[PDB]
């Protein structure tokens, strides 16, 4: 997250880190046995780390649980990033408490202008690199389809939204991928793609979760 602030410890209790030796992408817990993330973050072995704030220190709130099943959307397209969404089933259920909690799926899609909270342990610099140990937060609004499609002509499908700022300076980046965009208590976005991070006139683009509630529910019931 570029241009953000350090979240209060354990204030984002549905955020997960996906780990394969080290943190590589984010995710959100949506029920006790299932995490949702981005399909472009796919790898064959993943450990899910819940209850994290500082990813470099063991703090005593953490649960580390191995993924048992990894399911990418059947129509994910690696060229356009359409349908960039993946579900992970945990090998044993997470135990829900004050530091580990689910986030609701969306009851409807969101209005332009809606304010949201984006979080993750991705890159924090817009020139260079630096990955933080402490979770970072950023508040940003859903952009109208007009501002989003003008930024990326021909590249925005019906399953994508833009959230962020056209002046640059504040955005998600590498390592935030798969993490949550939560607006009025509902998971509306998954960090997906963009041109660079925090560039003027190039806001982040996010998978539009309100189109996938049926797929998520049907996949959970079947597995
Ligand atoms: Ca920790």
Give the SSE map.
Blueprint: E1 5-6, E2 15-19, E3 23-31, E4 34-37, E5 47-50, E6 63-72, E7 86-90, E8 115-120, E9 136-141, H1 145-151, E10 160-163, E11 180-183, E12 186-193, E13 204-208, H2 213-222
Bound molecules: calcium ion (CA).
Gist of the model:
By secondary structure, the chain is mainly beta. The chain has helices at residues 145-151, 213-222, and strands at 5-6, 15-19, 23-31, 34-37, 47-50, 63-72, 86-90, 115-120, 136-141, 160-163, 180-183, 186-193, 204-208.
Structure explained in plain terms:
The protein is mainly beta. The chain folds into two domains: 1-12 and 103-210, Thrombin, subunit H, CATH 2.40.10.10; 13-102 and 211-223, Trypsin-like serine proteases (Thrombin, subunit H), CATH 2.40.10. It is 8% helix and 32% strand. It contains two helices and 13 strands, in the order βββββββββαββββα. The strands form two sheets. It has a seven-stranded antiparallel β-sheet. Strand 11 and strand 12 (186-193) form a beta hairpin. The structure holds calcium ion (CA). The site of calcium ion has 7 residues, from loops.
């Amino acid at each position: 997250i570029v241009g953000g602030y350090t979240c209060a410890a354990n204030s984002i209790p549905y955020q997960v880190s996906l780990n394969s030796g080290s943190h590589f992408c984010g995710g959100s817990l949506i029920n006790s046995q299932w995490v949702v993330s981005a399909a472009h973050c796919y790898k064959s072995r993943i450990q899910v780390r819940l209850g994290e704030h500082n990813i470099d220190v063991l703090e005593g709130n953490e649960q580390f649980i191995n993924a048992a099943k990894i399911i990418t959307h059947p129509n994910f397209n690696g060229n356009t990033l359409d349908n960039d969404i993946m579900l992970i089933k945990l090998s044993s259920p997470a135990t829900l408490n004050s530091r580990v909690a689910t986030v609701s799926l969306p009851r409807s899609c969101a209005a332009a202008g809606t304010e949201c909270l984006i979080s993750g342990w991705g890159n924090t610099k817009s020139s260079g690199s630096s990955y933080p140990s402490l979770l970072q937060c950023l508040k940003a609004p859903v952009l109208s389809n007009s501002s989003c499609k003008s930024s990326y002509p021909g590249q925005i499908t019906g399953n994508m939204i833009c959230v962020g700022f056209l002046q640059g300076g504040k955005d998600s980046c590498q390592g935030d991928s798969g993490g949550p965009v939560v607006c009025n208590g509902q998971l509306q976005g998954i960090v997906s793609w963009g041109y660079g991070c925090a560039q003027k006139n190039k806001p982040g683009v996010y998978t539009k979760v309100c189109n996938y509630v049926n797929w998520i529910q049907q996949t959970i019931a079947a597995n």
